[PDB]
Design a protein around this ligand. Structure first.
Ligand SMILES: Cc1cn([C@H]2C[C@H](OP(=O)(O)O)[C@@H](COP(=O)(O)O)O2)c(=O)[nH]c1=O
Ligand SMILES: [Ca+2]
Length: 141
């Protein structure tokens, strides 16, 4: 934790975006896929369901946002660095834009998994979801 000052923000290079909630970044030389902490996007794959309303689109935001971005950083919480899959969870940042929250403020996502204490950003995306719901964004539509 040295001086850092809480959570640290590490650069990274965008490789390939899967959907709203998941992408492959080159965090410290080495390809790796990442999961968005406290956040869920309408399922997109797994037949165990099908295209969740706002699914395809829900992924038509994270992609570019990352592509249109010239640089991006990753913020590790305080809990586990990755989930039982090899996919690390963080609020991936894009030009100071909280994708996880960005997507939340947009009605393209829901607040899922708040983990203790790997959720040092709860409230934040919470107020947003309330705003995207107080008006009726996509889902909450
Ligand atoms: C976001 C998140 C997902 N996970 C795991 C739980 C879920 O398991 P299960 O798939 O078996 O239901 C899965 C949901 O991630 P997806 O939104 O990619 O499905 O990832 C965590 O353990 N901690 C997390 O913060
Ligand atoms: Ca999802």
């Amino acid at each position: 934790a040295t001086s850092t000052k809480k959570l640290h923000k590490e650069p990274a290079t965008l490789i390939k975006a899967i959907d709203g909630d998941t992408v492959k970044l080159m965090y410290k030389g080495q390809p790796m896929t990442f999961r968005l902490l406290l956040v869920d996007t309408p399922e997109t794959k797994h037949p165990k369901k099908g295209v969740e309303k706002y699914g395809p689109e829900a992924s038509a935001f994270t992609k570019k946002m990352v592509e249109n971005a010239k640089k991006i950083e990753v913020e590790f919480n305080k809990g586990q660095r990755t989930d039982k899959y090899g996919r690390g969870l963080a609020y991936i940042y894009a030009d100071g834009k909280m994708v996880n929250e960005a997507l939340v403020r947009q009605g393209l996502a829901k607040v899922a998994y708040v983990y203790k204490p790997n959720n040092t950003h709860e409230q934040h995306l919470r107020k947003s979801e309330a705003q995207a719901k107080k008006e009726k964004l996509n889902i909450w539509s």
